[PDB]
């Protein structure tokens, strides 16, 4: 929430609304560790990144193996005062953020700035839905990283079985969002077809040598 001084400065200056350059990554069907390493290096290089759909990351192996690994992690606590001990976060976005934090140099101001440059969500929230197209990391995708015969696990199911009470909430919100987007995209089909037809028809009216150059370069 902005302060009244910040609002007054903005009003007095009169400049228009500003948004910095932010990359939004759709993390569905990505390998957790490879995605974390790539994102950590980009954060250190100076990018602002927002990751969505953190509950559909992938890990290799069976859910039972990965759940046993998490329980072993959860067993560690400072015996003398557990309120100081390690804090075990159960949500998939917190799991991703902790993996990245362990891949960063966290006890330095530079590493702290890098870690604060990252935002993580489950699903796609309304303040992110309409900001532009999402990206993928092609060198960290499951269909090219795992052999197809081997089993794998989805982060949401494992996190649900170790804690994380909000799986059903996220599922309902995602279903509603996809329904709304599907309705909107079913609309505008006529407009898209009209623009495609206009593009096809303009060739008959533009100059012939321009058409020839387009055909030569393959934009025909």
């Amino acid at each position: 929430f902005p302060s009244r001084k910040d609002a007054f400065r903005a009003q007095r200056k009169g400049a228009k609304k500003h948004r910095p350059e932010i990359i939004v990554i759709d993390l569905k069907d990505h390998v957790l560790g490879r995605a974390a390493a790539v994102v950590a290096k980009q954060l250190l290089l100076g990018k602002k990144i927002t990751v969505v759909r953190c509950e559909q990351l992938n890990i290799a192996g069976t859910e039972i193996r990965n759940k046993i690994k998490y329980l072993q992690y959860l067993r560690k606590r400072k015996l003398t005062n557990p309120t100081k001990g390690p804090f075990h976060h159960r949500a998939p976005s917190d799991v991703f953020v902790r993996t990245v934090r362990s891949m960063l140099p966290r006890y330095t101001k530079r590493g702290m700035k890098a870690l604060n440059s990252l935002v993580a969500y489950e699903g796609i929230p309304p303040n992110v839905v309409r900001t532009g197209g999402r990206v993928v990391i092609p060198r960290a995708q499951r269909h090219v990283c795992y052999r197809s015969e081997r089993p794998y696990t989805v982060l949401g199911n494992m996190c649900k079985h170790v804690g994380w009470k909000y799986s059903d909430v996220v599922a309902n919100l995602e279903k509603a969002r996809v329904e709304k987007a599907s309705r909107h995209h079913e609309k505008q089909a006529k407009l898209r077809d009209a623009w495609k037809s206009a593009r096809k028809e303009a060739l008959a009216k533009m100059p012939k040598h321009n058409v020839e150059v387009l055909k030569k370069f393959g934009y025909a």
Partner: protein, 119 residues
């Protein structure tokens, strides 16, 4: 999907002979094949890995059989060959040609806008 078989036409993906078309003349093993093409000067008989080929939809069944099949003409006619030639054209281009392409695209966009408004 297109199968790997004797006489099948393939395109090379990477390497010094990339974006070239040849014919499979012998299956050495699960990973390697022998490729030749009399038409191309650089495509004499050699060994290629199967990670470096893309099968096409033509299979002759050597120079006489290839000429009779006329798969080279069909490949020249399809849209992939057009894309490859356009990529080579874009690669070898000058500032003047880039300017000409820019004005052609701007002309097409303007006329598309006019047609859309008219309709």
């Amino acid at each position: 999907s297109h199968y790997i078989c004797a006489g099948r036409l393939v395109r090379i993906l990477r390497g010094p002979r990339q974006d070239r078309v040849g014919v499979i003349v012998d299956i050495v093993d699960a990973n390697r094949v022998l490729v030749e093409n009399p038409e191309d000067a650089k495509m004499w008989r050699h060994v290629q890995n199967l990670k470096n080929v893309e099968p096409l939809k033509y299979c002759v069944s050597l120079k006489d059989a290839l000429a009779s099949s006329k798969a080279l003409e069909k490949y020249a006619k399809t849209r992939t060959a057009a894309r490859v030639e356009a990529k080579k054209a874009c690669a070898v281009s000058t500032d003047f040609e880039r300017y000409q392409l820019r004005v052609a695209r701007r002309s097409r966009a303007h006329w598309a806008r006019k047609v859309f408004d008219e309709k």
